[PDB]
Amino acid sequence: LLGDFFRKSKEK
């Protein structure tokens, strides 16, 4: 997972 981190790890 990565492309998700930049967007958001969990919250905002």
UniProtKB/Swiss-Prot annotation:
Changing residue 9 to A: Slightly increased MIC against E.coli K12 (MIC=15 compared to MIC=5). The chain holds residues 134 to 145 of 170 of the full protein. The lineage of its organism: Eukaryota, Metazoa, Chordata, Craniata, Vertebrata. This is Antibacterial peptide LL-23. Poorly active (MIC > 150 uM) against E.coli strain K12. Is able to induce the pro-inflammatory cytokine TNF/TNFA or the chemokine CCL2/MCP1. It comes from the Eukaryota. It comes from Homo sapiens.
